Symmetry: C11
């Protein structure tokens, strides 16, 4: 199953997981401080991922940056 | 399953999931504020995704941009 | 796990039309896009062909093609 | 499962689906007007596709053009 | 999910002949193409070999080849 | 499943299927005259293919030529 | 299943496994000292990994560096 | 499933199929005259193939040439 | 499964397997002397591998070096 | 399943298949003379292959050459 | 399933299988003299392979050389 790499470029970045299934809501928000990296898969419980805050992101489709 | 990356280039962008199945309707709209990124899969419940508003989108077939 | 098509409307009133899978072929849904909206649409248990009408920039795994209104 | 892209270069381009199975005949003809695009899969019901008329065609093996 | 061949007729009366899969081998269908028409034909449960007669431009996963009439 | 493309470069080329299994024998010989093309799979019944006669051959390993008699 | 390579560039780097499932929490934190390498899979129990401290990281998507 | 192409560079090239299983011996020998081509798979009954005589051979790992 | 190559660049390099499962602990420590090479899979019992000591390592993701 | 290509570069080359399982021993030694090519798979019964004698070898990882005593 | 190629560069090189399973111990040591080549899979019984002595090694990750 595929994954996303997120590197926080500032304190307070949120990596938020969205529920798989008929309904869509946030079930977890992981806080990243500056320089921390999270590598996060899609899973049985998480079919969409939202990033809030400034971070460097890598996926299979290349690099993108949130602000 | 494939996924799409959507980065909102202005406030109020909507990423809209359309129902899988014989019926087609919107089941969810995720609102993105400028500079937020959403990475969203195709799923048992979502077989088409629509984006409204200004955004930079990546998929397996390359970059495309939506404009508001 | 199926393939998908990206459609970006280059004018108002673009229609992305889904054709039914199976022995019966007909249109079952027509999605209206206005200028600059994007639809990323899979082939599905219900949709085995997709017709685009109106001016649009389309990406498939075979590359770019453009429809003209 | 594979698909063919068909872009009509004139009115009345006919995309013809041939039946899968021991018998071969057409079971559907989808006409396209100039500039419309049809992205059609091979399926449980369609194992061969014929294009009549002027059309620009993409498949996994590259581009080909039909002449009407 | 089988492979498919692309056949473009370069003259009228090209024949794309499907041969039967299985222990026995015979022609089960000849699809006749006129000049400029394109047939995209899979290998299937019933067709394990395809013969082209007449002048045609052909694409398969191993490249381009041309039949001559 | 893999296939081979055979284009006859003279009359009377044979494309010969050998039986799959513990027994090996020819079960079919498809005659090609000049300019005809056969695109033939490996199958539940054919696990080896012999070409006799002058032909241009494509497989997934590239181009090979058989030389006639 | 995919894996991530982490080389500690300073002492006390923490590679933290997050639980797979409805619940998300840290179930393990592996401490690396300077110059140690950990190569770590996604698994039945671990569906996200977090690195804290200065490290050089390789994944399928290329190289990235965490900072302390 | 993999296959090899064998082109005979002289008369009487011998393509030898070795039996798959705990035992090894040849179960079939197909002779090729000069210029003939055999395209042969690995199968339930053949798990090694030997070529005797001058032949031009292609496999997934490139070209090799047997000499008589 | 994926495997890692580890070449000891000094004596007493440790290639340590961490248990797969809810619990994470060392189950095995393989000591390599200078110049020895260990080629080691991920497996039913081993879902993370830690290298301590100076070594040259290859993974699908490319080269990395652990240092003493 | 993977296979290795072995071309003998002198008489008397041996390609030795080692048994798959908890037990490791030689179950078969195929003797090759100069110029002959063996294309051998890994199988239910053979999980390692040893080559003794001068030979030119291809595998998915590239060319390697065995040298005889 | 993958394999590794080992060419011995001097006499008495040892290619050592380590047991798959909860337990890790040797199980078999194949001695290669100079110039001999062994091509060995990962298997139900072997999940790690050690090379001791001077040898040229190829894996899917490239060339590496052990030193005695
Ligand atoms: N609960 C939704 C979440 C989702 C995934 N991808 C989306 C795309 C758009 C909107 C919502 C989603 C689902 O599993 O289908
Ligand atoms: N409910 C439709 C939604 C859909 C997916 N792709 C489409 C293409 C065109 C029109 C509708 C769609 C389906 O699951 O098949
Ligand atoms: N209902 C038809 C639709 C179709 C798909 N590809 C086509 C090509 C030509 C004509 C019809 C089709 C099918 O599922 O087979
Ligand atoms: N009914 C035929 C259609 C077909 C597919 N490919 C062909 C090639 C030649 C002739 C007919 C065909 C089949 O399913 O096999
Ligand atoms: N009925 C034969 C047709 C065939 C396929 N490929 C061939 C190659 C040679 C001769 C015959 C064939 C089969 O299914 O096997
Ligand atoms: N009956 C043999 C035919 C064959 C395939 N590949 C071969 C290679 C050599 C000799 C015979 C063969 C089989 O299916 O195994
Ligand atoms: N017992 C843990 C080991 C592990 C794998 N990857 C990790 C990443 C971080 C922390 C622990 C791990 C598991 O199988 O999941
Ligand atoms: N327990 C969560 C952990 C997780 C994986 N990826 C995520 C992305 C965002 C938030 C949480 C996660 C899950 O398995 O789904
Ligand atoms: N009967 C043997 C034939 C064989 C395949 N590859 C080999 C390598 C070496 C020696 C014999 C073999 C087997 O199926 O395993
Ligand atoms: N019987 C052993 C053969 C073997 C394969 N790979 C090896 C590597 C080293 C030593 C022995 C082996 C096994 O199947 O596992
Ligand atoms: N018996 C161990 C062998 C092993 C494979 N990879 C390793 C890495 C480190 C330590 C031991 C191992 C296992 O099957 O898991």
């Amino acid at each position: 199953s595929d994954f996303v790499v997120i590197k926080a470029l500032e304190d307070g970045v949120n990596v938020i997981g969205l529920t798989r299934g008929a309904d869509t809501r946030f079930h977890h928000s992981e806080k990243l401080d500056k320089g921390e990296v999270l590598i996060a898969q899609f899973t049985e419980h998480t079919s969409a991922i939202k990033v809030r805050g400034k971070a460097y992101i890598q996926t299979r489709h290349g690099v993108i940056e949130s602000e």
